[PDB]
Amino acid sequence: SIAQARKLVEQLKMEANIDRIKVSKAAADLMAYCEAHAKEDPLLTPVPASENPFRE
Amino acid sequence: DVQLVESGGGLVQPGGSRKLSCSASGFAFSSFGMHWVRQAPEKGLEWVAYISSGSGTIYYADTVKGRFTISRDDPKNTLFLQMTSLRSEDTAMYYCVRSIYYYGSSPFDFWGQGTTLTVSSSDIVMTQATSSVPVTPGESVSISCRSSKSLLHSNGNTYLYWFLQRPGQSPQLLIYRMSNLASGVPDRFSGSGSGTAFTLTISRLEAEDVGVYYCMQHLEYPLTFGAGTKLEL
Amino acid sequence: LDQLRQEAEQLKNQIRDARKACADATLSQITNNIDPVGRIQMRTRRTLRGHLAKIYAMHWGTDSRLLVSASQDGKLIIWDSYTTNKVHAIPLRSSWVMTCAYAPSGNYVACGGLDNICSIYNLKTREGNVRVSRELAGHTGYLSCCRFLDDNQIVTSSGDTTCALWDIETGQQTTTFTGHTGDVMSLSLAPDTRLFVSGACDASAKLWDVREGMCRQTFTGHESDINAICFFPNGNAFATGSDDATCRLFDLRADQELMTYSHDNIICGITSVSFSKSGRLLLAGYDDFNCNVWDALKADRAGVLAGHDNRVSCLGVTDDGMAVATGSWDSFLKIWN
Amino acid sequence: DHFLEIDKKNCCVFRDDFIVKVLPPVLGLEFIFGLLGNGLALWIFCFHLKSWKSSRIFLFNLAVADFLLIICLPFLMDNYVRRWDWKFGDIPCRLMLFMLAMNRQGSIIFLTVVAVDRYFRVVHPHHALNKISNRTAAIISCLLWGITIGLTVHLLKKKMPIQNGGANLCSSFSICHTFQWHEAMFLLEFFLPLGIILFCSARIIWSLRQRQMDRHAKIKRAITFIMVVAIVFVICFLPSVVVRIRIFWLLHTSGTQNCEVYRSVDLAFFITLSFTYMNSMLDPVVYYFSSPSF
Amino acid sequence: TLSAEDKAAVERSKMIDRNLREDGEKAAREVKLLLLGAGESGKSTIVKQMTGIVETHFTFKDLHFKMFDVGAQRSERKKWIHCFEGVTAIIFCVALSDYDLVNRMHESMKLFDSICNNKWFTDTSIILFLNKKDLFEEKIKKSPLTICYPEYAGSNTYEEAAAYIQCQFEDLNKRKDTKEIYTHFTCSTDTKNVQFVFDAVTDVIIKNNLKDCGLF
Ligand SMILES: CC1(CCCc2cc(=O)oc3[nH]c(=O)[nH]c(=O)c23)CC1
């Protein structure tokens, strides 16, 4: 049929309507978020056993 | 309908052998640990006996140890308290409180109706100080209750409970573990405090809030009740 | 028609060209300057020992203490992870269960599987027992994932190629999402619960809009079925885990692949994927009975979590980031801190 | 004359040098393979083979009983190199003679339990006893070990060091004109489980062919591995019984007089009794390693 | 070193494990069978003899059986076939009269070959039912078997054709040593169709028990 093809074409047009930022910018924001919030990651930096809810 | 019905109490001669039956209908009776609580006429509540789910744990009060015996019948949904050799100090109204214990549960939520009985003629101490204070609608009042031992535990829980008893009725749970509001209780009730110093506040007071207010401890058996502060006017 | 096919191929070519043009520098070459995290060693703090068959799913409560697990012995178990106590144990009508969820508020849980039905359970009842609150029917394939939006909404993905947003109060599909060409195997809600992503068996992922319902963008690049998906904490990226022994990171704004997490000694597929609280480590469960921790910014194996004797099927990380729980096809769950 | 006065029992005790040369080698040969077989298997039973169902627990108990029976060979070599002389104390004899008799009987109890367990799994496949919990497989083991300990505890309440002229004896099997429950039990622990083994081993080979499952090669290998064990048990524990029955026969013609008539037979008794340790060293061969699963 | 509430919670937990153990012991005493077919083979009449998955329970000689019919699952078989790794046996139904056209016998052969040689179903034996045999005799009397099997050299007799079909189905398993195939001619007959299942399952259970021992 053609209804499926028409729906696919409309979906492709809708996706083509999207604008995209540069890749380096996205990497920059990801790195900035990781660095900003690295201070409160118990799995990353092993928390001392005194405030560890699991002993096991 | 989570009603509890108690029957079998009445006039007894000294040294009797009366037994009371508590019938439950409206909840999973097999998974609830059931208590027995009495109340002398011109006095306050006093915990009596307890039986666990599966009947694996039974505790008694010092006053009735060896004289009262507790038991349950799961398929018939009945709770028994067989007592022998009564004395004049046992004349009291008996309640049939229920309690379920898992992480985050609220024990002592539903209280029975009370069955009166008349007899022919290392324990934590809780002090409630004041015994009467007049209030007015639209005002905010605070009630204090002090414990002899620190109720705060090594796991962070402060085992303190609050109860409200309307005139001619059964007590209903208000606060459990000193901060959590019971289900169905209006939001105008609040609880706070630290070890050996607890305070319940009632902001924006109105009617149907008068009666007697008690405090209880669940840190270790036997459980104890405060004297109770009566709220009037 | 031939015109439709020509237009579709031209649009695909234009999308590929725009994607290529928007790329200027790889993430790895930008990141390499940063400090590596080094070796990561985690020890089995707890072992939950209740089930009697393979464990297929698990979920964490929002208080970071209670969790629910589902196994093919027809049982749902809620654990107190601090003391390894069993708070509840719910027997299921159908023993073929492939998914599990925990409500954000803690009142409800969900279930589903080969019976094409999602079941909602009411944990906090005045009767003292856990009872089924609503059964949601209308899918024509097995259920693969489910996630709560709130106490009254839920979104499910099935093997009948479709996804749907339900309404537990009335039990009717408020919206249906239909754009895939294979079974849908995974689901992940955005932090604000306005978007979500799905990983299907046609080696593609799509970004939907919950409010009205339509596919915004589709991300390709894998070679086989996608078995797991998870959102980055920022809400602007997600990672997929497929059957060709690889994991990838896609970015919503750039609409392009960013990095690939593969190694030569691994040839088995990935069953589950999750991040860490800061979004620096990416954990992934494999069929070779191991869970591998990846330096999410440099694609370096930081550590290994080897304590399971069978395939690791489920994996989650607490909301405060203090622990990670793994289940496997033996009947044991483990907590790694 | 070889008349020795054991406690109110008239007996005859002999000494020989053939028992000095023949026996230390045959004890050492069995001893070395005993360690070689019961160490590797016992290590595997704790390190590898994480199955540990009800079936494996009984084999573990058999292995530990066999290994503990082989532990006490060096003392026997020490006692046999000398012409029947004991150089230890009063306690390391009242404790051996108990360890020997409590470790010989445990092996026979457990290799009968294994036979019954295998009988119940091919003749009554759907019985409830084939799926007992792993805790019952330990409760039963402890109860059987207790029964084993109780039956041979009377050897702890006797002063065993006795002097025959200028020598010492650690012997519970002296030829005496009495019935002392260490001979009746000696006959019983062979004759009683022999029937249980020959019945449970012949009802398997007969019920495994009416179902016509023997065409599979593994069923033939299992049938051979079932006849082999019943043959090994008979070969090991049965020349000793023959000799003991012979002396019991010869002890009714006379009470005790001219003990020279006992001179030949008891040398054969102590020579044949050393075969009963071959059972424990062959047990790794007929179990464990030879299993296609272990 | 536990408070009252913690002790009560531990007691409730232990009761939960006791109930779980009892339920697991009850469930382990049951026979699980997986029923497969080509859609028109005759699984319906087989079920008559004794929206997602369909379950059927029956009892024979104090034994409890459970049969799972996956017929309405029109999704990728690879994505849920590992759920059934561990069933006691697999029951495969094929109609002897379905060699007419619309090829059907070749589809059945392909399905049997794919299911028999699988990573998960390496040790699970297979019980094969070749049903609708009176129709097969009627069809043989008129049309020859050479339509479905061109490379056939034998007389057009029911016995020879049935034996040829059985052999061509049975020669499809590669692991001829870890797996066994039991074949039966159903025809919608009396009950032997449950007695045969009982015998096959008893053989499977005996072999599993011998494996658990260590001799196998
Ligand atoms: C322990 C010594 C005596 C052996 C006597 C005897 C023979 C034996 O080997 O096996 C035996 N087993 C027994 O139970 N009792 C024996 O007397 C016995 C000093 C070397």
Residue numbers in the entry:
A (entry chain G): 8 to 63
B (entry chain S): 1 to 121, 124 to 235
C (entry chain B): 4 to 340
D (entry chain A): 8 to 301
E (entry chain C): 4 to 53, 182 to 233, 241 to 354
Sentences reproduced from the published study:
In this study, single-particle cryo-EM was used to determine four structures of human HCAR1 and HCAR2 in complex with the heterotrimeric Gi1 protein: HCAR1 bound to the subtype-specific agonist 3-chloro-5-hydroxybenzoic acid (CHBA), HCAR1 in the absence of an agonist (apo) state, and HCAR2 bound to the subtype-specific agonists MK-1903 and SCH900271.
The interaction analysis showed that both MK-1903 and SCH900271 established a salt bridge with R1113.36 and hydrogen bonds with S17945.52 and Y2847.43, resembling the interaction patterns observed with other HCAR2 agonists. For HCAR2 subtype-specific agonists, the defining characteristics were an acidic group in OBP1 that formed salt bridges and hydrogen bonds with R1113.36 and Y2847.43, a hydrogen bond acceptor in OBP1 that interacted with S17945.52, and a hydrophobic moiety in OBP3 that contributed to hydrophobic interactions. The specificity-determining element for HCAR2 agonist lied in the absence of a steric clash with L832.60 in HCAR2, while presence with R712.60 in HCAR1.
